[PDB]
Amino acid sequence: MPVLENRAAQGDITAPGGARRLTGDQTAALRDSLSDKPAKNIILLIGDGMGDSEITAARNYAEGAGGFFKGIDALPLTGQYTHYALNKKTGKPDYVTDSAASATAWSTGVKTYNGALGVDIHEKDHPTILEMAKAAGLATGNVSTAELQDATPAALVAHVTSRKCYGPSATSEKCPGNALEKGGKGSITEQLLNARADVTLGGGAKTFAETATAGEWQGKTLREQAQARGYQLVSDAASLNSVTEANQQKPLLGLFADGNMPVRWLGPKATYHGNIDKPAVTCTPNPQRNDSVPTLAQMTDKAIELLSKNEKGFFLQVEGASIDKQDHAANPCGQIGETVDLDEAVQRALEFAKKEGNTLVIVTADHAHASQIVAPDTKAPGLTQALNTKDGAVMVMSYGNSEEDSQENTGSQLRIAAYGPHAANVVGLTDQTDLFYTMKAALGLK
Amino acid sequence: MPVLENRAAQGDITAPGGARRLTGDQTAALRDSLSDKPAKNIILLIGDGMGDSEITAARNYAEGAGGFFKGIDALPLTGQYTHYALNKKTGKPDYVTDSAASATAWSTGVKTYNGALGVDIHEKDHPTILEMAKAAGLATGNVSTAELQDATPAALVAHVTSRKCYGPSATSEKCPGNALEKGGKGSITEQLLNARADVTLGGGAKTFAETATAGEWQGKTLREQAQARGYQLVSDAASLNSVTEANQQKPLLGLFADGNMPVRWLGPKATYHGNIDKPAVTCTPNPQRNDSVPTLAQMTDKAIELLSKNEKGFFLQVEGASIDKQDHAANPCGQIGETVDLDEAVQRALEFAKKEGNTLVIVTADHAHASQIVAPDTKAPGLTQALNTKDGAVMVMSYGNSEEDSQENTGSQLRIAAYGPHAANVVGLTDQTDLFYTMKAALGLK
Ligand SMILES: [Mg+2]
Ligand SMILES: [Mg+2]
Ligand SMILES: [Zn+2]
Ligand SMILES: [Zn+2]
Ligand SMILES: [Zn+2]
Numbered sequence A, B: 001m002p003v004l005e006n007r008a009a010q011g012d013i014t015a016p017g018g019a020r021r022l023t024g025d026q027t028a029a030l031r032d033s034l035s036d037k038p039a040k041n042i043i044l045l046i047g048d049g050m051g052d053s054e055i056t057a058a059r060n061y062a063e064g065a066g067g068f069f070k071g072i073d074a075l076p077l078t079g080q081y082t083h084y085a086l087n088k089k090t091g092k093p094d095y096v097t098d099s100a101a102s103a104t105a106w107s108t109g110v111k112t113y114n115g116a117l118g119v120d121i122h123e124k125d126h127p128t129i130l131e132m133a134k135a136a137g138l139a140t141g142n143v144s145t146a147e148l149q150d151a152t153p154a155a156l157v158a159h160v161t162s163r164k165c166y167g168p169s170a171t172s173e174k175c176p177g178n179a180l181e182k183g184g185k186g187s188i189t190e191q192l193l194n195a196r197a198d199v200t201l202g203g204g205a206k207t208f209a210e211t212a213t214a215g216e217w218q219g220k221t222l223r224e225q226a227q228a229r230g231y232q233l234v235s236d237a238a239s240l241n242s243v244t245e246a247n248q249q250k251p252l253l254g255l256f257a258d259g260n261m262p263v264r265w266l267g268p269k270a271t272y273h274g275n276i277d278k279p280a281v282t283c284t285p286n287p288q289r290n291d292s293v294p295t296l297a298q299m300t301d302k303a304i305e306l307l308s309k310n311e312k313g314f315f316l317q318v319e320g321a322s323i324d325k326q327d328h329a330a331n332p333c334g335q336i337g338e339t340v341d342l343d344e345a346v347q348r349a350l351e352f353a354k355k356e357g358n359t360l361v362i363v364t365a366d367h368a369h370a371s372q373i374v375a376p377d378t379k380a381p382g383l384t385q386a387l388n389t390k391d392g393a394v395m396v397m398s399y400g401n402s403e404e405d406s407q408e409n410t411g412s413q414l415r416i417a418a419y420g421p422h423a424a425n426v427v428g429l430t431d432q433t434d435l436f437y438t439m440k441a442a443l444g445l446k
């Protein structure tokens, strides 16, 4: 099963045929990409907010328009999927989802209202694909660059009526019915600790500082509870590399930042008429990113090494979290840098899957975002910025959907791509909930 | 070779698995969709400005979020393609193309600068897929709801340095090197009359009123020249249906409007804070659309009937033109109504192709546009409108990329889908210029 090795412009883009990405007929390669054999493992990579617009902007900047992302763009089976949410009150579609409702959709197979995690519009819990894999005896991993209580990773292990219920304090107040002391299952963090994935890596150390209001570990901080329940905690690259085993006996929990891990690139915020009134930007690497902080590609690779020791197989979800956040911040460089970061992780995943042979790799996003690529001379109502791309030309980016501080999500359907057994299921138009069924069936779970 | 019969939500969207669009594994069906056999015909459908955002918005409104476009969404092989143009001066990429540069790309295989038609950055002419099909003895048709001089249909038969050179007067001034009286090939309309496609249907009757400044029909109107060169002119649905033959001896030219044909639906324009300050809109059919004016599905059907009588096969390009135009006008109803209109034309194309068996059908857009689907409570800097959808819920649409009168094109990569032999070539990431090569090869042209 072939991954697309090179879809960059074949030559001189100004000459006939120079901008072609194809070198011959793809029929036979596509036939070789089709397999309904069972998937032993599944690696799901999510770029938060990574719509087709975000992937194009990032490719134009980092690789040039005729360039090619060796990870993101190399998946051969591609399609478009819908991710609308539901209005809790009426049960009707809500056309623009938030990250909580979308994550619940592919992780449980049931649509829900914006803000919910692991429950339907009736607030009923539904098992997640991770809980299910684990019950079947597979190793499971949840990796992200955001706080681990954030919507995307949390949806795999928590069931609460509001994404805001990070730890005990917030829960008692926002999710009283889930509050441990009110007999509920607990806050996002408490449920995370209970779920016990073999490998969990990300930010969000902060909430682990809270102390439980009830239960067996009442009085202890959630950090204390984790060590007590037998988790191996790590907080830096070095310690992370030191790990050799990760299992139910000694599950791994890496907390590399108080909040969200640091962004790869820095650049200024987009401004009103910024492509007109201001010079073009060249993004710059973040000096704080750090040698002590594992990159997404490093966290991905470690997770694969450890989960790979389970003969039954594994389920891994990897999230390039700050794409969405930088997009909300109307910060092109932060946004593009996080997409490039994600590409590196996709590469690692694809390299393993290619050699292992029974691994389904899927790359997609939870929903679309605000950023649009507009003409250089554009006079727009929102925030714009001109950037200097790898082509040595200027690309302008516009965030024009909000007058508030942060730019919002949008509802366009968007790319979904896959490689490996059962990837045919992402071709054509599908729904985000079909993703849950595709993964459950490929792994043969019940 | 199966078309996707139904990918609408299979059930109750609020229940587990109710929003699924799939009912089982797709591997086998995709294997049956793969064929490298030669294509006898090719039908290319272009929705101008119909990016993934435009398709989602129109689907949500007309069919409901969990709905399905029986034409547009029924193509089984899907991918995403890039359509960047080139800076004429530097030869570097220009990330946001206009319609002329994009149409030239798929129609000739060479990238060009914004505003060019059928020429490269050096202003050299390159033969189009239509000129090539005709030279090989295939029948050819060019159908559009815009003026026939507009960029999309023009690119198939004209080679001029500026898309503004509609007829003799504009040409003599804007494209002096092309002006007939200066020894050039002539204006867009004069070149259209020389290319002599078997079937050409659209608007733009107005420019045909100009008179040639030189040549054999000097002094006559372009309308008179057409009749004198033996074209069968028709101007209404009835005369169009009367046609029984269309060929080189008696080629058909239908001019159904002075300018662009009438839009399908009416609705007011989006406005600043329109989703807040104003009630939701329900689109209404346009009384002027007329029983005397053929619809895009009608023109497509008549064109297929006529071109089908050529044993060698045919090439037909069909354009749903006002999607782009209404999008530029910040008019949701006009925009969605043209997308629905195009779906009807895609249905007729697919019905024929499904029974004929050697027809490649491709549906895509020249570039992306401005509209974004945003939360209902959005307070945006641009123009917004709330719409009442088929789901009985409200969808809000934002045009936030221009302070000028018209909203602009954007540069995201966007969906391309196909059905038939050689459709595999649109899967994964490709470039718009690859489409010229895919069609040339599928048809076996030289
Ligand atoms: Mg996230
Ligand atoms: Mg057009
Ligand atoms: Zn999100
Ligand atoms: Zn988001
Ligand atoms: Zn266009």
Ligand SMILES: [Zn+2]
Binding pocket: B048, B049, B098, B099, B324, B409
């Ligand atoms: Zn356009």
